[PDB]
Write the structure tokens for this entry.
Amino acid sequence: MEDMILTEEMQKIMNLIQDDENNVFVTGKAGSGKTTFLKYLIEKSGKNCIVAAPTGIAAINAGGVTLHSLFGIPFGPITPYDRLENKFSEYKVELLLKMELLIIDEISMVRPDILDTIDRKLRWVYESDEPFGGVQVIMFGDLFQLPPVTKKQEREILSDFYDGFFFFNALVFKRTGFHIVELTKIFRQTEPEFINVLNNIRNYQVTSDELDLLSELKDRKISSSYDNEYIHICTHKADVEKINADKLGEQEIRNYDIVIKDKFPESSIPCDLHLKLRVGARVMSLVNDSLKGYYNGMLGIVTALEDNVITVRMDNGRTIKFERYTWSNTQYTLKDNEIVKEEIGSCTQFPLTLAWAITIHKSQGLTFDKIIIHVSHTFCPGQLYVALSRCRTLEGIVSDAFITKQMIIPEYALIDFERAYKSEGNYYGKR
Ligand SMILES: Nc1ncnc2c1ncn2[C@@H]1O[C@H](COP(=O)(O)OP(=O)(O)O)[C@@H](O)[C@H]1O
Ligand SMILES: [Ca+2]
Ligand SMILES: [Ca+2]
């Protein structure tokens, strides 16, 4: 990227990371430039960086590696007194010993014990008492997107040792801490009234006027149809697959298989395994290409299907000839005494997926012009905030049922964290 804007908030982060004793939590809503600024921070860093993330898909998109493979972490809850098989290769040890700056993306998807397992592993390899073995730690993510639901079993094992199931509850943050910088510029568009409604909801300050706006979002006619430009945002996987497949149909179906090359983790695959399409299918772009003119999350309609090209007319009116795309699975090594990346696998497939409907989970980090919210009549803190936040404006939202005050379920663990650091020098943990 070459026309990137350097905001005062981004420079504040760069100012902070100069002092290599400073850890930093970089946060902000979808569209506030976290992924782009991450890349900038990489390039403009005089330090051997490693980028890691808690899922393969997020690792791949950030150009990094999973936390579990980087540090050899067993899958499952781990107390501070569960003993680790600290078996690392001589190369992994040498690599970790050259890491000066660890960057964790999607920090809010990191279950807290994993940070502590990481702190322990680094202390063992550095033979030090300093948290994370003295390595500087930068963390990127939206504080207000919930992590994976805690499985009934992890719940029981871990509650004896932790106060909460958010990343800042890691025990290491009694021994170290971090500055917080929220990115507040939304580059795609700037919408005060909508942004203020989202914030009022997440802070449980909804005014009676705002409660009335939510009521007017209901529209049975629009929300029960599938031929408009609205995308159905639903919580459950089954509902989205039902809607997408129902609309796809069985007549004149074209199939495109994923091509795997060398070593690629199944759960890191960010595309369809068997992309099935037809002329007129509603689809979403999965990757960004500024020169070709599409971005991750752009919606369009298939108009032509050939062997190696899928022609799509996007919502903005442009026709685009999509070709297959190759995601690279990389890992870090040492070239001399410098950390570099090396490809160990790839997968190849058209970067499009059916998009009459998308899950709340698959749409993490995306915004759309027009959404139909399916009210999750269950409950759980923060659901309605997440669903509303999938839109770019207030006027673009439609609901399948009336939105009532009781559907606003606040997450007080998060409100307390925000208000506590905002009044403690934008810093959390030990000084
Ligand atoms: N520094 C920047 N200057 C100009 N545009 C930006 C900048 N950062 C992000 N954008 C724009 O915002 C959109 C995506 O932002 P992104 O980096 O994905 O933010 P996030 O990860 O917070 O969702 C793109 O349209 C991109 O061009
Ligand atoms: Ca992002
Ligand atoms: Ca240090």
